[PDB]
From Swiss-Prot, chain C:
It comes from Saccharomyces cerevisiae (strain ATCC 204508 / S288c) (Baker's yeast). Keywords: Acetylation, Cytoplasm, Nucleus, Proteasome. The lineage of its organism: Eukaryota, Fungi, Dikarya, Ascomycota, Saccharomycotina. The gene is PRE10. The chain holds residues 6 to 245 of 288 of the full protein. One of its GO terms (biological process) is proteasome-mediated ubiquitin-dependent protein catabolic process. The keyword Cytoplasm applies. One of its GO terms (molecular function) is mRNA binding. The alpha and beta forms are probably products of the same gene with different post-translational modifications. This is Probable proteasome subunit alpha type-7.
UniProtKB/Swiss-Prot annotation, chain D:
It comes from Saccharomyces cerevisiae (strain ATCC 204508 / S288c). SUPFAM superfamilies: N-terminal nucleophile aminohydrolases (Ntn hydrolases) (SSF56235). The proteasome degrades poly-ubiquitinated proteins in the cytoplasm and in the nucleus. It is essential for the regulated turnover of proteins and for the removal of misfolded proteins. The proteasome is a multicatalytic proteinase complex that is characterized by its ability to cleave peptides with Arg, Phe, Tyr, Leu, and Glu adjacent to the leaving group at neutral or slightly basic pH. It has an ATP-dependent proteolytic activity. The 26S proteasome consists of a 20S proteasome core and two 19S regulatory subunits. The 20S proteasome core is composed of 28 subunits that are arranged in four stacked rings, resulting in a barrel-shaped structure. The two end rings are each formed by seven alpha subunits, and the two central rings are each formed by seven beta subunits. The catalytic chamber with the active sites is on the inside of the barrel. It comes from the Eukaryota. Belongs to the peptidase T1A family. Its main location: cytoplasm. Disulfide bonds: none annotated. It is found in: Cytoplasm; Nucleus. It holds the Pfam family Proteasome. This is Proteasome subunit alpha type-5.
From Swiss-Prot, chain G:
The proteasome degrades poly-ubiquitinated proteins in the cytoplasm and in the nucleus. It is essential for the regulated turnover of proteins and for the removal of misfolded proteins. The proteasome is a multicatalytic proteinase complex that is characterized by its ability to cleave peptides with Arg, Phe, Tyr, Leu, and Glu adjacent to the leaving group at neutral or slightly basic pH. It has an ATP-dependent proteolytic activity. There is a cross-link at K182 (Glycyl lysine isopeptide (Lys-Gly) (interchain with G-Cter in ubiquitin)). Keywords: Cytoplasm, Isopeptide bond, Nucleus, Phosphoprotein, Proteasome, Ubl conjugation. Belongs to the peptidase T1A family. Signal peptide: none annotated. It is found in: Cytoplasm; Nucleus. This is Proteasome subunit alpha type-6. Its main location: cytoplasm. The modification Phosphoserine is found at S9. One of its GO terms (biological process) is proteasomal ubiquitin-independent protein catabolic process. The 26S proteasome consists of a 20S proteasome core and two 19S regulatory subunits. The 20S proteasome core is composed of 28 subunits that are arranged in four stacked rings, resulting in a barrel-shaped structure. The two end rings are each formed by seven alpha subunits, and the two central rings are each formed by seven beta subunits. The catalytic chamber with the active sites is on the inside of the barrel.
From Swiss-Prot, chain I:
The keyword Cytoplasm applies. GO terms for biological process: proteasomal ubiquitin-independent protein catabolic process; proteasome-mediated ubiquitin-dependent protein catabolic process. Pfam families: Proteasome (PF00227), Proteasome_A_N (PF10584). It comes from the Eukaryota. Keywords: Cytoplasm, Nucleus, Phosphoprotein, Proteasome. The lineage of its organism: Eukaryota, Fungi, Dikarya, Ascomycota, Saccharomycotina. Present with 16800 molecules/cell in log phase SD medium. This is Proteasome subunit alpha type-4. Belongs to the peptidase T1A family.
Length: 244, 203, 232, 171, 194, 236, 223, 228, 197
């Protein structure tokens, strides 16, 4: 039997509860620039002895697409595993190229929607900011909600501090942003949201930008590109904080 | 040999900024010639597919690829490109590998973004054979191989490309028992496609 | 109240109430005990006489599994038979795949996994029996005791049922004061008689020396010696 | 699929079973003159020598399938009591070479039985009226009598539905 | 065996042999090897014994199901497409339908006669005239010689007379004549004076 | 009915998962794991209430693989279920991918199973917290801990149980003042036992502790006689 | 807690199983007893014809029912299936003890799995095999007891008490089927609060006797 | 998904409510074309408008589908409809009629109101297009209950009642809109009753065009100066 | 069963359908917003009309059509009206998570036969034969009219009489079914001429 059902007001209750779970989640944000996308999030820890470097809240789906979440982490982990699986089997093995951001986002939304309409399963308690690049649509940033609804954004924030983060991004965001300025604005918005310690180990950033052939892992095939997604290391974030 | 039942041949060549694909029109039941109107070249936008081999499989794959490219265009809001379509054809042949289709496809087209010629073929091993000069398929593949290998030269103008490919097809078809009854040549450019029917031996 | 009407539900305390109610069902059963001796194990059980019309020696309660494992249980006797049937299937499958008879700890784990599985889903009920079982294998004598929760441990001596506490009071004294198989049978009879405070005493045992490691029932002269020792 | 704490799980058809044959009778009780009276098949054949007076259609289909299967498998007519088990309130009536004429209503055999809202009085009227020497004529007329307050099974005719106007006029 | 079809200016003419032969003897000499799929579509079929009629009745049932479902007469082009799908699927199934068909129809929306030849592999081809098996080995030369797209039904019937005479003269077996049916804007009719 | 099956409450909480967390403490035994320079040690309280028990069998430390060991906090039936599943997964990985499953891969796979129980309403979460320890072929000494919610993370050192906070406080103080720098696994075992004693304020006999040591190419559990030597060395 | 067969009560009882046991108390009494040589079933049928309370499984075994008759049909058909399988695979007359254990293990399934209900019928099985005459009592809970004699169904306690007092006697009845049947008919009598040739039913099996049922005139000489 | 004591299905009624809370959709069919419209709701500054998809989705070269309700369910319906439209061609080599695709979508929606273990789609749809080798426009509606109907003009979603009242007294059955311009004018006027527009015109021979923001701007300017 | 009774309520809210069978034919009549712009053939000789949830009627009609063709495919003989009614009734029975909220009038002729047939089915899956019947909203009133205007000993004799009785009962689309697969729906102007007269 279905666990997600329409209430007399027409709302889906479990979807509202999953959105509440998301609103309790840690703040994460993404900013779309003229020459890239930056998606950032802060990393709270279960203990000071926990090795936070083992958990990545920003994950690569395809070498040109990456996702960050807000809400329940295990749900995000399984949903990312499924997203990678489908991006490979249902698109790349068929067409020889990785799906564009729009189609992969549609497929993630499909996965999340099925949990909203199948019996014996609750909705995913996460919202995703999926940033990617593709040749025909360019850089794009999508937010995906527990219901499977997704919209494109110039900049956005999800989680606990989403309201203040979005109010700040509306003021800061503008056209002709270069990706370095987008990173700067992302770090400022994330600093204003984090009440704890703020450094390269409590913050996680990744960018969709220029192709990185050095990360390709091989040479000699001129037509292979190299990932556009790249996580900023702890030191790379720290050096930028030292110039904030 | 299922591919030899109906016969027919397809050849694709690359010119200067343009592509040509040509095929014979004969459909036959082995020795008996049935139809002179069975065109083996289909297009799914700006990308052309010539399919030789068993005629039922040719029709089945034409229907299947029309379906798949229509869905691709609806979902992606863009037309499928020659390279993406080559990958799609390769994967679709593989999905039936055990109990395969008895066909040899030939993709021909111009990539709309880069605007440069593309032709590709698929062999029995299923390996994509993307060629800079020409692809041949069908019963007269040997005749076509020698003919194209002698006549082809790089960077042919469209009017010279037409003559080269039409002569290659006509002289190979003349020496193949199961090929003939007319030929059609497509000259594919950035902006237009010209379809021509060739005068040839009707025996 | 509220969290105890289904088998798969945790209460706010983290306790599963249906399993605890199955334990209550176990507590109602007749007393059964197991004793581990230096080279074997001994099983005994209190069989209550419901009426004079029961044929007095043919309502056997102790069950053998394969040839070296003996099982005795208290609580819902049909559930004990169900568990023993599953144990026999497991032992037979092990012997089929591997020509060696199933080791006692391996058998204990198989039964524990089966019993615990009945505590996972709401569509099934926990076993209402705590099962003392054991035997002799390539590495000695082993004595185990399941609980409706699927929990089990190795024991030097085990008791369960309505008289489990009185029986444990004597098992502790046995372990403190010692116990060979011959003496083990008599002490098992003594413990059953003491804990009973009509019934038929049924005894069984598996020892490397005295049974060559095969599970056998106590009958005839040895049974009568155990009974008179208990009366003594 | 549950037991109560007390241990128990939580028209009018009249039949008379004589030694010359069984007789069944029913109140059609059409709702309106428009309803096709012919289509009220409230007495049905189960086998050549078995019929019943009444989920109904499905059960009757399975009963007919079982009876024909038994005939196919054994080249013999299914015993009514065996059919009751192997198979709405029912009156099952039929004949066999083991016990002859029978009528059943968990199934218990009856010499005569009534079902429906009139059962509670028809039972007393049957108890007062039924006797062993009834010939098929009196059995028919007594069916009609208790209805006021057709079909038959015979070794010669088998199960058949009635003629009827005449037997009413003879009442 | 003999299944012939000719498309003329206004109609489609299908001819099929009347004989049914099982082994040593001719069982029937009046068999009709055609099914009316639609009020204006007619399918002739030939091949091995049981498959022909089984496939024909299956196709007729499915086409009538489509027609009733959509309250619309499927065009001959769509009917031939469906028949080709069914043949092409079965050829790579456990038991293929080894059946060759000619589908002659009058497309009421285009107001044009249409003739399609489909072999047991699913090789659909739209033809001016058609013939399945060895029957084409004799009739195609006559049809190539005499066929004109502008013939009237009378001229097409005369050309079928010529083809059937040639088959009777040279082909070894006795196919007991042909049944000739005409598909037209007025529906399907049978020529008895043939 | 949001409190009886794994579905969201109006607060977005999954009360069944949170109650499964409560179950983990119901065995009332504490454990801690520390990483040495080249080995990992796990310490767990072996509380034995009954004199008739065979202490050899009372054990919450499992040898999942040649290299990986697992200590469980929670009911022993669920702990054994988890251990069996982890053993099966490690063997299947060694079969499919041709090399021993890494500790963190096993932790991720187990946390994914746990998350599945937290997503499918038919299945209840296991009331166990799993702590995997190994000396990884690449990453070296490793501690990974999985919880009923499907969350897992690597640790420098970790403790679990009713007095988890006290042990974690002691470890935090030591790590501030100082991995555990020792030259052989015996010294880090002695260090772990010492900090267990100090945090719990309770002396231990050879019967009160169960100890598992992860070294290169072997995870093994110390017998009571070895723990006796370790306690003697601490007494010195 | 009594709504389904899966729920334990806080006291550890399965209410549905106890309700199924109460279902048997609604059925008419049936009595069973045996010597070493012969085993007897005596049943009070109730009406309309008197429903047959005895069921024959084999020449060497048969049974009677108290409670819900459809459950009796199911269990008896399963028992036939097992006996036929034993004779099919081993040519071995299935022992009465093993048949009883098969019934025990089959019925216990319904008391643990959801979706089913316990069999609301209690059965008495008598048989003769290489071990002699046997008598088993089957209950909805799955429990099976091998007995010298017993009675089940409404008001069977009186017959059971009579059998308890008479046990010293009828165990000694070797090779005298008539005296055993007389003792059985006397025992069932104390459960009445009468017997007619059509109401009463009797069955017997033993060393020489294949399982036979007496109904009608056949039982007249024993009333 | 079970009957109420009064015979209504609770989940279907609540899905109808979910549709009623959804954003507006409107369509009018004239002599030669069908026009679909919706208000952008582009009041948010950071929404990426240039790549935001339109409400109107092509199912096939000759058919478009608009909807109001839950977007996620609408995408499932759209993908199923596209797959069926292509499958019909692959089976019988003709494109679907608008009636056939409407019936398929309605059957999909119905199946979820009767099958157990699933909830209804909270989406009502407007399906517009032209039949193969035909020139008369077709416009249809589907809603969660699984029933469908043909319309000369219709609106769904929030404020559907008001603009439907407007349409009833502006659309004339005897003299329907005669040109694309009049259809677009009427569609814009109907949407302006609710207080930026996207307009899609579907025309025979698979001609589907989204009117540019300047073109709707000119239409709105004409309508506004008419209002004065 | 409660769900079946609620399905009956859904049936009784639906628009009324009516049928009358005369000597030679069966006539089915049916009761059909400002901006908005029943009888389904199962086979060439059988028609089905329904009242209730329109959506469920499509499921039933599709299944009935599939069975009507499958019968011809398995047995040469086309379905009889009795057989199709029985099949539709069984299909309705089996679904009782929710029943079909539809009652159906099934009319037509048996293959190569000339006795008109009219049948009814209801959500419980009970079916019966009628000389004239109506289903749907206010079906009781119009049925009461039929009971007194329809005559069992002298039923309508011609298509005109059957259509007249149907129109009077309804007081509109009319479908006339006649042997040899003759099914025709009357034109609007014909129905208007009947109504005015």
């Amino acid at each position: 039997f279905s666990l997600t059902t329409f209430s007399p007001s027409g709302k889906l209750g479990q979807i509202d509860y999953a959105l509440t779970a998301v609103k309790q989640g840690v703040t994460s944000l993404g900013i779309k620039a003229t020459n890239g996308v930056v998606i950032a999030t802060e990393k709270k820890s279960s203990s000071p002895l926990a090795m936070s470097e083992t958990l990545s809240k920003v994950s690569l789906l395809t070498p040109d697409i990456g996702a960050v979440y807000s809400g329940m982490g295990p749900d995000y982990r399984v949903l990312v595993d499924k997203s990678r699986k489908v991006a490979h089997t249902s698109y790349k093995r068929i067409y020889g190229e990785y799906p564009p951001t729009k189609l992969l986002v549609s497929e993630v939304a499909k996965i999340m929607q099925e949990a909203t309409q199948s019996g014996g399963v609750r909705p995913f308690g996460v919202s995703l900011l999926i940033a990617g690049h593709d040749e025909f649509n360019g850089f794009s940033l999508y937010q995906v909600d527990p219901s499977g609804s997704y919209f494109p954004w110039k900049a956005t924030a999800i989680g606990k501090g989403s309201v203040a983060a979005k109010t700040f991004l509306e003021k800061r965001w503008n056209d002709e942003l270069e990706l370095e300025d987008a990173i700067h604005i992302a770090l400022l918005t994330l600093k204003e949201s984090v009440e704890g310690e703020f450094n390269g180990d409590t913050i996680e950033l990744a960018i969709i930008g220029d192709e990185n052939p050095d990360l390709l892992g091989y040479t000699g095939i001129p037509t292979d590109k190299g990932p556009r997604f790249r996580k900023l290391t702890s030191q790379e974030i720290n050096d930028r904080l030292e110039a904030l | 040999d299922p591919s030899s039942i109906n016969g027919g041949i397809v050849v694709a060549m690359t010119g200067k900024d343009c592509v040509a694909i040509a095929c014979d029109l004969r459909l036959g039941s082995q020795s008996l010639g049935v139809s002179n109107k069975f065109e083996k070249i289909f297009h799914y936008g700006h990308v052309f597919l010539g399919i030789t081999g068993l005629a039922t499989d040719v029709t089945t794959l034409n229907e299947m690829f029309r379906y798949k490219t229509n869905l691709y265009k609806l979902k992606e809001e863009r037309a499928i490109e020659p390279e993406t379509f080559t990958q799609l054809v390769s994967s679709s042949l593989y999905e039936r590998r055990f109990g395969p289709y008895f066909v040899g496809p030939v993709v021909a087209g111009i990539n709309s973004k880069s605007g440069k010629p593309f032709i590709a073929g698929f062999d029995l091993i299923g390996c994509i054979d993307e060629a800079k000069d020409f692809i041949v398929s069908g019963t007269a593949s040997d005749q076509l191989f020698g003919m194209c290998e002698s006549l082809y030269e790089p960077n042919l103008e469209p009017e010279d490309l037409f003559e080269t490919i039409s002569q290659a097809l006509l002289n190979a078809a003349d020496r193949d028992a199961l090929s003939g009854w007319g030929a059609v040549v497509y000259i594919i450019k950035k902006d237009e496609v010209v379809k021509r029917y060739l005068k040839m031996r009707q025996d | 109240t509220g969290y105890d009407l289904s088998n798969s539900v945790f209460s706010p305390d983290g306790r599963n109430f249906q399993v605890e109610y199955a334990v209550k069902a176990v507590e109602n059963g007749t007393t059964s005990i197991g004793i581990k001796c230096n080279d074997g194990v001994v099983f005994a059980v209190e069989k209550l006489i419901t009426s004079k019309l029961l044929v007095p020696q043919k309502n056997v309660k102790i069950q053998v599994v394969d040839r070296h494992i003996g099982c005795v249980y208290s609580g819902l006797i049909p559930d004990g038979r169900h568990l023993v049937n599953r144990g026999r299937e497991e032992a037979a499958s092990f012997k089929k795949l591997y020509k060696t008879p199933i080791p006692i700890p391996a058998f204990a784990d198989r039964l524990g996994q089966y019993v615990q599985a009945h505590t996972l889903y709401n569509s099934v009920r926990p076993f209402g029996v705590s099962t003392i079982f054991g035997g002799v294998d390539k590495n000695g004598a082993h004595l185990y005791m399941l609980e409706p929760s699927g929990s089990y441990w190795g024991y030097k001596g085990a008791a369960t049922g309505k008289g489990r506490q009185s029986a444990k009071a004597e098992l502790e004294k046995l372990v403190d004061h010692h116990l060979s198989a011959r003496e083990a049978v008599k002490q098992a009879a003594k413990i059953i008689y003491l804990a009973h405070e009509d019934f038929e005493l049924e005894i069984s045992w598996c020892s490397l020396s005295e049974t060559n490691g095969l599970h056998k029932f106590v009958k005839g002269d040895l049974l009568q010696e155990a009974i008179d020792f208990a009366q003594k | 699929s549950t037991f109560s704490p007390e241990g128990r799980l939580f028209s009018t058809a009249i039949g008379i079973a004589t030694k010359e044959g069984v007789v069944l009778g029913v109140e059609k009780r059409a709702t309106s003159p428009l309803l096709e009276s012919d289509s009220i098949e409230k007495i049905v054949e189960i086998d050549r020598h078995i019929g019943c007076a009444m989920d109904a259609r499905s059960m009757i289909e399975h009963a007919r399938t079982a009876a024909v299967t038994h005939n196919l498998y054994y080249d013999e007519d299914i015993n009514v009591e065996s059919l009751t088990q192997s198979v709405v309130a029912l009156l099952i009536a039929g004949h066999d070479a083991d016990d002859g004429y029978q009528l059943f209503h968990t199934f218990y055999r009856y010499n005569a039985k009534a079902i429906g809202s009139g059962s509670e009085g028809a039972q007393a009227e049957l108890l007062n009226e039924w006797h062993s020497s009834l010939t098929l004529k009196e059995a028919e007329l007594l069916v009609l009598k208790i209805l006021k307050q057709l079909s038959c099974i015979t070794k010669q005719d088998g199960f058949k539905i009635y003629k009827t106007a005449e037997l009413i006029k003879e009442l | 065996d003999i299944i012939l079809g000719i498309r003329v200016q206004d109609s489609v003419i299908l001819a099929s042999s009347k004989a049914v032969t099982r082994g040593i003897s001719v069982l029937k000499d009046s068999d009709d090897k055609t099914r009316q799929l639609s009020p204006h579509t007619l399918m002739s079929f030939a091949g091995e014994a049981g498959d022909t009629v089984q496939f024909a009745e299956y196709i007729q049932a499915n086409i009538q199901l489509y027609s009733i479902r959509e309250d619309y007469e499927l065009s001959p082009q769509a009917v031939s497409s469906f028949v080709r799908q069914e043949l092409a699927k079965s050829i790579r199934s456990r038991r293929p339908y080894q059946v060759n068909v000619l589908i002659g129809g009058y497309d009421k929306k285009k107001n044009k006669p249409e003739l399609y030849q489909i072999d047991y592999l699913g090789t659909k081809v739209e033809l001016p005239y058609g013939a399945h098996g060895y029957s084409g080995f004799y009739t195609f030369s006559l049809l190539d010689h005499h066929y004109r797209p502008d013939m009237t039904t009378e001229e097409g019937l005369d050309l079928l007379k010529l083809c059937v005479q040639e088959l009777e003269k040279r082909m070894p077996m006795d196919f007991k004549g042909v049944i000739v049916k005409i598909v037209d804007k007025d529906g399907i009719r049978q020529v008895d004076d043939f | 009915y949001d409190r009886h099956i794994t579905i969201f409450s109006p607060e977005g909480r999954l009360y069944q998962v949170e109650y499964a967390f409560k179950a983990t403490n119901q065995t009332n035994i504490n454990s801690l794991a520390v990483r040495g320079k080249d080995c990992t040690v796990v310490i767990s309280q072996k509380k034995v209430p009954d004199k008739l028990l065979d202490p050899t069998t009372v054990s919450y430390i499992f040898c999942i693989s040649r290299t990986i060991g697992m200590v469980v906090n929670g009911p022993i039936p669920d702990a054994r279920n988890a251990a069996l599943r982890a053993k099966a997964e490690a063997a299947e990985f060694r079969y499919k991918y041709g090399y021993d499953m890494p500790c963190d891969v096993l932790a991720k796979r187990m946390a994914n199973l746990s998350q599945i129980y937290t997503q499918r309403a038919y299945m209840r979460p296991l009331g166990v917290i799993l702590t995997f320890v190994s000396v990884d072929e690449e990453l070296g000494p490793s501690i990974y801990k999985t919880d009923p919610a499907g969350y897992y993370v690597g640790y420098k050192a970790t403790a679990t149980g009713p007095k988890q906070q006290e042990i974690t406080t002691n470890l935090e103080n030591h790590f501030k003042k100082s991995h555990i720098n020792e030259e052989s696994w015996e010294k880090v075992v002695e260090f772990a036992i010492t900090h267990m004693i100090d945090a719990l304020g309770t002396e231990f006999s050879k019967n009160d502790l169960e100890v598992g040591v992860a070294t290169k190419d072997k995870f093994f559990t110390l017998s009571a006689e070895n723990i006796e030597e370790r306690l003697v060395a601490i007494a010195e | 807690y009594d709504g389904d067969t899966v729920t334990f009560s806080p006291t550890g009882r399965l209410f549905q199983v106890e309700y199924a046991l109460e279902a048997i108390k609604q059925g008419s009494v049936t009595v069973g007893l045996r010597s070493n040589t012969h085993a007897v079933l005596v049943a009070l049928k109730r009406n309309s014809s008197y429903q047959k309370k005895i069921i024959k499984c084999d020449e060497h075994m048969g049974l009677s029912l108290a409670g819900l008759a459809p459950d009796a049909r199911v269990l008896s058909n399963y028992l036939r299936q097992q006996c036929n399988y034993s004779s099919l695979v081993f040519n071995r007359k299935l022992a009465v003890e093993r048949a009883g254990h098969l019934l025990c293990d089959k019925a216990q399934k319904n008391t643990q799995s959801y979706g089913g209900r316990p069999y609301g019928v209690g059965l008495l099985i008598i048989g003769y095999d290489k071990s002699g005459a046997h008598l088993l009592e089957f209950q909805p809970s799955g429990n099976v007891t091998e007995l010298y004699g017993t009675a089940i169904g409404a008001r069977s306690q009186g017959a059971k008490t009579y059998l308890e007092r008479t046990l010293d006697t009828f165990i000694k009845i070797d090779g005298n089927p008539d005296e055993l049947i007389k003792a059985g008919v006397e025992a069932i009598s104390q459960s009445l609060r009468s017997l007619t040739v059509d109401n009463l039913s009797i069955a017997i099996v033993g060393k020489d006797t294949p399982f036979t049922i007496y109904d009608g005139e056949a039982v007249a000489k024993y009333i | 998904s079970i009957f109420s004591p009064d015979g209504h299905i609770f989940q279907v009624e609540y899905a109808l409510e979910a549709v009623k809370r959804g954003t507006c959709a409107v369509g009018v069919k004239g002599k030669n074309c069908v026009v679909l419209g919706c208000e952008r709701r582009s009041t948010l500054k950071l929404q990426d408008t240039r790549i935001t998809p339109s409400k109107v989705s092509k199912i096939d070269s000759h058919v478009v589908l608009s909807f109001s309700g839950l977007n996620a369910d609408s995408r499932i319906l759209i993908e199923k409809a596209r797959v069926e439209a292509q499958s019909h061609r692959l089976t019988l080599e003709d494109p679907v009629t608008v009636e056939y695709l409407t019936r398929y979508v309605a059957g999909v929606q119905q199946r979820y109101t009767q099958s157990g273990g699933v909830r209804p789609f909270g989406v009502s749809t407007l399906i517009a297009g032209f039949d193969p080798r035909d020139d008369e426009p077709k416009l249809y509606q589907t809603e969660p209950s699984g029933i469908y109907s043909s319309w000369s003009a219709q609106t769904i979603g929030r404020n559907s009642k008001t603009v439907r009242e407007f349409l009833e007294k502006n659309y004339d059955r005897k003299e329907p809109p005669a040109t694309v311009e009049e259809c677009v004018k009427l569609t814009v006027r109907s949407l302006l009753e609710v207080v930026n527009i996207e307009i899609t015109v579907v025309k025979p021979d698979s001609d589907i065009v989204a009117l540019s923001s300047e073109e709707i701007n000119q239409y709105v300017t004409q309508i506004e100066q008419e209002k004065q």
